From a paper:
Neurofibromin 2 belongs to the FERM (band 4.1, ezrin, radixin, moesin) gene family characterized by an N-terminal FERM domain that binds to the plasma membrane, a central α-helical domain, and a C-terminal tail domain that binds to the cortical actin cytoskeleton. Neurofibromin 2 is a unique tumor suppressor protein that inhibits cell growth both from plasma membrane and in the nucleus upon cell confluency. The neurofibromin 2 head–tail interaction is critical for controlling the tumor-suppressive function of neurofibromin 215,16, which seems also to be regulated by phosphorylation.
Author numbering: 15 to 339
Write the structure that this text describes.
């Protein structure tokens, strides 16, 4: 009764470090998630999740379900990856905390370096120069001599392989730019990185292999702004886009999704996805990106009505004071 343990070890991998916790057997995804966020000193929690792997696909820990009721490998230690599941529409405006900025920066940078997000050559060099400023601080020629970035992974392999320039030549190109960032703090460098990275075409898009009613292979993109249909030969530019405020509803029925445009003149867009595991993620990401999009609109409109009011209050206050003279 009191001899069976009340907890089990869970390993949590962030972009920074790994750490272990005592997860209570009864705990839900929310309990474990909140413990991780508290430990990290992270309050902008809504962008994040705890990911594991079901078969070959990614699975996020569901908040309302028991940790142990998930299909996660139970070999000691049960491991989860603390990652961003949602991206802001404007990183500079939305990522208030340094920890949030840092975690987004490392994850997005890994996506860039792993070629999960296409990045052109010049952009890649500029991005590397900010990653160097963030890690090394201000450029110092007496300390940062030739070969100082020799052991660093700074550009996508795709970019390195297009030119056949030597590592020291890439380092020179990166150092030339790095010299221009003198004075910028770590958080400032990481934010300049994100401002460039957030304008990349594949940034923040969750792609899924889908088929239309005619059996034509396409890619679905679920992002902060809406649902997007890509031709599989082009992941950069979608051919059709349905912004979250221009969708009446999304319905799912027997491996078939139906996007119902708000404009009744546009016909419904039906598509098929085979794996039920994937269909659960698509729905999750639609419901949750839609909700965050709506909340940004509510925050935007509230922020306007607060300025309007404060301007009227302050203008009227200052007028009242002028009439007392």
């Amino acid at each position: 009764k009191r001899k069976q343990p009340k907890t089990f070890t869970v390993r949590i991998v962030t972009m920074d470090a790994e750490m272990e916790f005592n997860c209570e057997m009864k705990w839900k995804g929310k309990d474990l998630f909140d413990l991780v966020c508290r430990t990290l000193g992270l309050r902008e929690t809504w962008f994040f999740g705890l990911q594991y792997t079901i078969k070959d696909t990614v699975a996020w820990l569901k908040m309302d379900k028991k940790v142990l009721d998930h299909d996660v490998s139970k070999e000691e230690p049960v491991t989860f990856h603390f990652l961003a599941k949602f991206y802001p529409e404007n990183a500079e405006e939305e990522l208030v905390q340094e920890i949030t900025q840092h975690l987004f920066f490392l994850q997005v940078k890994k996506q860039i370096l792993d070629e999960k997000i296409y990045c052109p050559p010049e952009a890649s060099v500029l991005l590397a120069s900010y990653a160097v400023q963030a890690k090394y601080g201000d450029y110092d020629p007496s300390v940062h001599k030739r070969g100082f970035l020799a052991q660093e992974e700074l550009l996508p392999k795709r970019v390195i392989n297009l030119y056949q320039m030597t590592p020291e030549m890439w380092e020179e190109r990166i150092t030339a730019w790095y010299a221009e960032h003198r004075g910028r703090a770590r958080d400032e460098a990481e934010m300049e990185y994100l401002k460039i990275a957030q304008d990349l075409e594949m940034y923040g898009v969750n792609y899924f292999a889908i088929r239309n009613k005619k059996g034509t292979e396409l890619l679905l993109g679920v992002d902060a702004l809406g649902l997007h249909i890509y031709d599989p030969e082009n992941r950069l530019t979608p051919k059709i886009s349905f912004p979250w405020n221009e969708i009446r509803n999304i319905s799912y029925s027997d491996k078939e999704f139906t996007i119902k445009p708000l404009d009744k003149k546009i016909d419904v867009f039906k598509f098929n996805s085979s794996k039920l595991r994937v269909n659960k993620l698509i729905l999750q990401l639609c419901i949750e990106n839609h909700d965050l999009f709506m909340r940004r609109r509510k925050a935007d409109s509230l922020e306007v009505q607060q300025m309007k009011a404060q301007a009227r209050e302050e203008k009227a206050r200052k007028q009242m004071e002028r009439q007392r003279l």
